[PDB]
Amino acid sequence: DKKQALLEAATQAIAQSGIAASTAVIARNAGVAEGTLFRYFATKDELINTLYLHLKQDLCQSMIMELDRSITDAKMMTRFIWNSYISWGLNHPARHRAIRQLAVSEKLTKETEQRADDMFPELRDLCHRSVLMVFMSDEYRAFGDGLFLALAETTMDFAARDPARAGEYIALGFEAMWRALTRE
């Protein structure tokens, strides 16, 4: 049961300090010895990769469970998914900060990236139809993700601070993201 405590602790630490977060802090907060952290995860980077797959799985599971097959318009379907990402981040502030920091950390392996894209094949294919070509490229994909996550985190933040207008920020946010990242 310690693995899960380590994951949850590293989720909290990274959400607060990014990938600079200390393994000693993560281990202690999970109620285990740093030496024990390292027996579950031979390297810090190994912890980073597993954590990312774990969080990505969670987020994906949540978007799949809200996915309405009746929606048939492509942009409308992209909006309902943005909404899900957003309410997911609203329900789990730490998980989203962590995921945002992990996703753009350059410490994710090729196989990790692959194994993550192949979790929700149809959601992956959807996004990829609308996304600007350069944001699909091996050189700039990582940056397109970065742009998407900065936009969703700001939307999350404004929604959380002033909930009376949450749905307005989420909607304005989606419309900003859609013009920024998608093709004509």
Ligand X SMILES: COc1ccc2cc3[n+](cc2c1OC)CCc1cc2c(cc1-3)OCO2
Q: Which residues bind ligand X (CB under 6 A)?
A: 59, 78, 85, 99, 103, 127, 130-131, 135, 144-145, 148-149, 178, 181-182
Most distant pair of Cα atoms in the chain: their distance: 54
DSSP letter string over 4-65? HHHHHHHHHHHHHHGGG--HHHHHHHTTS-HHHHHHH-SSHHHHHHHHHHHHHHHHHHHHHT
Coil, helix or strand at residue 93: helix
76 binds, among ligand X, a second copy, none (CB under 5 to 8 A by kind): none
Minimal distance in Å, beta carbon 26 to ligand X?
21
* One of 129, 143, 160, 167 touching a second copy (CB under 8 A): 143
Task: Identify whether the C-beta of residue 124 lies closer than 8 Å to the C-beta of residue 117.
Answer: yes
Residue written as tokens 């753009």? 104
Q: Alpha helices of 118-165 — where are they, by DSSP H?
A: 121-130, 141-161
For a second copy, the closer of residues 106 and 122 by Cβ is: 106
Per-residue binding letters, 157-176, with a second copy (x by CB under 8 A): xx--x---x--xx--xx--x
Nearest to 131 by CA among 120, 121, 119, 145: 145
182 three-state secondary structure: strand
Q: Is 177 in the site for a second copy (CB under 8 A)?
A: yes
* Residue 139 interacts with a second copy (CB under 8 A): yes or no: yes
Nearest distance from C-beta of residue 12 to ligand X, angstroms? 18
**Span of 5-13, 29-37, 112-120, 148-156 interacting with a second copy by CB under 8 A:** 148-156
Cα separations in angstroms, 44 against 17, 38, 161? 15, 8, 34
Q: Contact between 150 and a second copy (CB under 8 A)?
A: yes
Which of ligand X, a second copy, none lies near 94, with the C-beta cut-off 5 to 8 A by kind?
Answer: none
Q: Which residues are near a second copy by CB under 8 A?
A: 104, 106, 134-135, 139-140, 142-143, 146-147, 149-151, 153-154, 157-158, 161, 165, 168-169, 172-173, 176-177, 179-181
